[PDB]
Structures are given as C-alpha cells and as structure tokens.
C-alpha cells in the first residue's frame, strides 16, 4: 500500500524536474537578457536622437542596432544634435554677432 | 497599408463604411516603401503592436502584472476578512493605485526620482540654458 | 530522486523568493527591472547594464541633452517625448530660421 | 555669405521637410502615433499598474511587518542583542502573523490557484508554472488535508486582530509615502505634507 | 546626483515577500521529503533491519 503512496511521492519528485528551470532563472534571466533590455532603452535612444527618429532609427535603426553595439549609437546620436546645436548657431556665435553687430 | 492600417484598424473594428474613406489612407503607407526596408518592424508596432509590447510596455507593464500574485495572499488573508477587505487592503493597496502612480511609481518609489525627479524636471534644464 | 533533489530541493525553497518578482523569474519579463525600472538600478552592473546608465556616456559629446536625454524614455517619457521632438525639430529650424 | 543661411539651416530643415514628408506615413507616425500613446500607451500599462501599485502597499511595508516575525526566526541565532528585540513585538506585531501563517497556509492548498493567480490573467501561462510549482505542494497535504479546511473558519475570529494590530498601520504607511515620490517632480520640499493630498493631480503635471 | 539606483525596488519583491508565504515552499519540500519520508515509511518495521 505505501508503495503506491510511495510513487506517488516520488512522482512528484520527478514531476517538479519539469518546474527545475522556474527558481535559478531569476538570478540567471537578470543578467542575460542583456541583448533585449538594451534594447528596449534602446528605443529610448531612438528619441533623443531626433533629428533621425523622424527617418529610420525610430523603427529599425536606433531601437535595435545600438543594443549590442552601442559604442555605435554615441556618435550616432550625439552627430543629430551636436549639429543641430552647431547650426543653431552654437558653434558659431561669434559669426553670427558680428554678422548681426556689423547690421 | 501597413503604416496607416495600423492606425486604422484598431479604428477600422469601428468603421465597417469607413473602410472606404481610410482605404485612400492606406496608400499614403506606399510612400514609406523605401523607409519600410527599416520600418516594417514598427509599422504594426505604431499604434496597436506598439501598445502591446513597444511604448505602453517597453516591457515594464510585463511584470507589473507579476509581483501582485503574492501580494494578492495579504489582501486576500484580510479580503476573506470581509470586515478587512474595503477598511484595509482596498483601502491602502488601491489608493496609490486608481489614478495617481499609474506614470510616475513604476518601482516601489523610484521611478519618479530618477524620470520626474531626475529628467522630467532636469529635460528642460538640459539645453533652454545651452540654445 | 536524489540526484533530482541535488538538483530539485533548493529550486522549491529558492521560488518563493521570486514570487512577487516572477517576472524577473520568468525571462519574457525580466527586462523591466533589467531595463525599464533600471537606468540606476544597473549602476551595480555597470558593465551588464548598458542600457540606460550609459546614456549619459552616450551624450558625453551631445552636452545639450546631457541632463535631459539621460533617464527619460525609460520609464514614462518613451510615450511622451516622441510627440514633442518634432515640433521641437519644427522650431529649432526656426531657431535655424533667425540664422536665416 | 550667400550660402552661409542655408549651411546650418538645411542641416536639420531637409529633416522638417522629411518630417513633413513622412509625417502620414511611418517616418513621423513615430512622433504622431504617440501623439495618442498619451492614452494609448497607458491602457494596457495602467490595469497592469495597478496590480504593480496595489502591490506597493504590500510587497514593500505589509510584509514589511515581517521584520517582527523574521527577526525572531533568523536575529536569534546570529545576534543576541536584537533577539532580545526579536520576539518582543512578535508577541504583539507578529501576533497576528502567527494568524496570518494560517493565512499564508490555508492560500497554499485553497486560494494559491484563487488568489496568487488572479492577477495575471494575460500571464496565465508564466503563473501556471509557478502555481503548479505551489500545487505541486499539495501532494503530500493530500494526507493532511483536514488542517486545510477548518484553518479558515478558526481564522474568522482571528481576523479581528488579524487586522487590528497586523493589516492596520504599515499597509497605510507605504500608500501615503509612495504617494510622495511622484509629487516631488515640480514641488519636492513640501511634498511629504502633500503626500495624501496632491497625489493625484501630479501625474498629469 | 542620480544616486537612486532601484535594485533594491528589485529587491524589495525578493527581500521579504518570500517570508509572506513563507509556507509555500515548505509543501513542496514535504513532497520532496516525502519520497524520503515514504522510503522511510517502508523501511520502518521488517525493513527496519536494513
């Protein structure tokens, strides 16, 4: 009679080897996702750079390639506004003084 | 007609006739052919596949349905307490959840320090000093 | 059953510990404690975590966005920001058209 | 100087013009489908938020209460000097957590596929595995199942200080205080007073 | 100053919502005992000389 009892005690020994992937994963899945949890912020990415979010980088561009190789996306993304300050007449006031000044 | 379908049919569920006023607002999708070669991944993911795992989740709201299983044995611990389920966990668990957090508590109290408290008030001071 | 419980035993005990973070059990919803609640929870995992705590690094030469394209999209202003970035692309060129 | 206007100007123009030209289709729906995301990314987020901010309550001071029943089952052996302020308050605090390890009990065989299931009804298939992970726990209760049902009705009496001294105070203490972080965006140094008062109006700030 | 850092917001569902139901686990660890407990069951009278 235990036997059955037995079994049934071992069958759920074995039956929690399909649950033995469901506690270490949450140590293990925090680390390597790695590849995925840039990618989502890289989306993020795909806003800052806006002076391409409304081309490419807010579909394909910045919200998947700068995720593994994100050395990339520094000067993919600081070019669009570095620029944009440079030609909003930033890296030239001086110009744009005396330009004005001589007016 | 992918860009605007997207647009659409979430409308379109709404807009049996109307289907032939958005059809002429399916081909403005064929200008961004070109754009497609990269934008075909987001064009579903705009407005409907983007609020399911795109900008309503970017995968936050993937576990914010997880924690509260647990948390569901305290309330229920005073929920099968009938004269403790209003008087305290509805009325402790749910008033920071109704309307207030919804944007800005995202983790236990952080998520505003680091987006409200750390860019949503410094986004501004980033460049109306430097422009 | 031994060789399992070698293997099975701290998994049962262990659970209970992510069980209100099952989702950072569960690999499909690790990712926002791994990245959307994370662009200072991955300052301990700096190298892990490139995601967001290197944005700033990431406009290390873009100084205007410096303090405001850091940690904003990755909780609440990835809805939000997109919006205005035209308006703001719109308008920046009027800032171009003063030039002009 | 008859080029220097459009130099810088076209830089980013050719963009306004491209965001002009892209702007029904998927170049600029980016910034135009979010346009709605001011509600649209906040339908599926904010039921799920909730389950997340009902949780703060919770998973952050309700079982924050624990310190009166976790300190006497792991201070006691480590340190003598807390374990004299281990089982003190237990006494009291955790007197009532003596009732509710009924209640974590009576959930395990009952109410876990009840309750730690309900709200996570699009991830059914995720707490499945964790509820037959806590089902599979029944098992050997399969022999000691008449401690599973008469736990409840005991509890009934014990609700009442179950929810006097343990589901009273700290549950109230994290609603209120988380209720001040978000309010610290624009007003922060006055915002622990306004904590319970200007929680809402906040967020659309 | 962005000095928040919120793993302890991902510790704070792993620090103390295992002790909540801290009796979970302890059903499943009378399951996995239990095979323990069986084999002892039936090495408890005549295979009490084993």
């Given at each position: 009679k235990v036997i059955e009892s037995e079994l049934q005690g071992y069958l759920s020994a074995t039956r929690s080897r399909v649950g033995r992937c469901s506690a270490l994963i949450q140590a293990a899945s925090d680390v390597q996702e790695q590849g995925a949890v840039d990618d989502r912020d890289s989306f993020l990415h795909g806003v800052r750079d806006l002076l391409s979010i409304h081309s490419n980088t807010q579909a394909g561009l910045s919200t998947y390639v700068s995720a593994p190789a994100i050395i990339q996306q520094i000067v993919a993304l600081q070019s669009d506004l570095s620029s944009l300050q440079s030609d909003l007449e930033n890296s030239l006031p001086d110009d744009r003084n005396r330009c004005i000044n001589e007016l | 007609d992918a860009a605007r379908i997207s647009e659409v049919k979430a409308w379109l569920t709404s807009q049996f006739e109307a289907v032939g006023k958005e059809v002429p607002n399916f081909e403005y999708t064929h200008r961004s052919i070109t754009h497609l070669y990269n934008l075909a991944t987001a064009s579903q993911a705009?407005?409907?596949?983007?609020?399911?795992?795109?900008?309503?989740?970017?995968?936050?709201?993937?576990?914010?349905?997880?924690?509260?299983?647990?948390?569901?044995?305290?309330?229920?611990?005073?929920?099968?307490?009938?004269?403790?389920?209003?008087?305290?966990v509805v009325s402790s668990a749910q008033v920071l959840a109704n309307v207030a957090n919804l944007l800005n508590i995202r983790d236990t109290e952080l998520s505003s320090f680091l987006v409200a408290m750390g860019d949503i008030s410094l986004r501004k001071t980033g460049v109306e000093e430097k422009r | 059953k031994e060789v399992?419980?070698?293997?099975?035993?701290?998994?049962?005990?262990?659970?209970?510990?992510?069980?209100?973070?099952?989702?950072?059990?569960?690999?499909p919803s690790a990712i926002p404690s791994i990245c959307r609640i994370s662009a200072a929870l991955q300052y301990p995992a700096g190298?892990?975590?490139?995601?967001?705590?290197?944005?700033?690094?990431?406009?290390?030469?873009?100084?205007?966005?410096?303090?405001?394209?850091?940690e904003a999209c990755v909780l609440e202003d990835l809805a939000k920001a997109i919006d205005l970035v035209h308006i703001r692309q719109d308008l920046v060129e009027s800032g171009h058209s003063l030039l002009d | 100087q008859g080029a220097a206007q459009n130099l810088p100007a076209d830089v980013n123009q050719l963009i306004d013009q491209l965001e002009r030209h892209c702007l029904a289709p998927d170049g600029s729906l980016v910034t135009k489908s979010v346009y709605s995301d001011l509600q649209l990314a906040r339908e599926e987020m904010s039921r799920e938020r909730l389950r997340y901010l009902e949780a703060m309550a919770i998973y952050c001071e309700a079982v924050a209460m624990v310190e009166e029943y976790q300190q006497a089952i792991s201070v006691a052996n480590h340190g003598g000097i807390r374990d004299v302020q281990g089982l003190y308050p237990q006494l009291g605090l955790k007197n009532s957590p003596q009732v509710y390890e009924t209640l974590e009990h009576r959930l395990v065989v009952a109410e876990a596929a009840?309750?730690?299931?309900?709200?996570?009804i699009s991830d059914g298939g995720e707490i499945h595995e964790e509820e037959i992970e806590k089902w599979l726990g029944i098992t050997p209760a399969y022999l000691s199942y008449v401690q599973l049902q008469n736990t409840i009705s005991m509890d009934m009496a014990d609700y009442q200080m179950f929810l006097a001294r343990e589901i009273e105070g700290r549950l109230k203490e994290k609603c209120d205080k988380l209720a001040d972080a978000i309010v610290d965006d624009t007003d922060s140094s006055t915002g622990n007073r306004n904590s319970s008062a200007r929680l809402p109006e906040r967020v659309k700030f | 100053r962005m000095l928040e850092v919120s793993r302890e917001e991902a510790e704070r569902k792993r620090m103390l919502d295992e002790r909540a139901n801290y009796r979970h686990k302890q059903a499943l660890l009378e399951a996995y005992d239990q095979q323990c407990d069986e084999a002892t069951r039936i090495f408890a009278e005549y295979h009490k000389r084993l």
């Open positions: - | 705009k407005s409907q596949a983007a609020t399911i795992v795109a900008n309503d989740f970017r995968l936050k709201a993937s576990e914010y349905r997880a924690q509260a299983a647990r948390i569901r044995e305290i309330l229920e611990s005073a929920g099968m307490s009938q004269e403790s389920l209003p008087s305290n | 399992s419980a070698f293997f099975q035993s701290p998994d049962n005990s262990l659970y209970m510990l992510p069980a209100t973070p099952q989702g950072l059990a569960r690999d190298l892990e975590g490139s995601d967001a705590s290197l944005a700033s690094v990431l406009e290390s030469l873009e100084f205007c966005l410096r303090v405001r394209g850091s | 009840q309750k730690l299931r309900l709200p996570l | -």
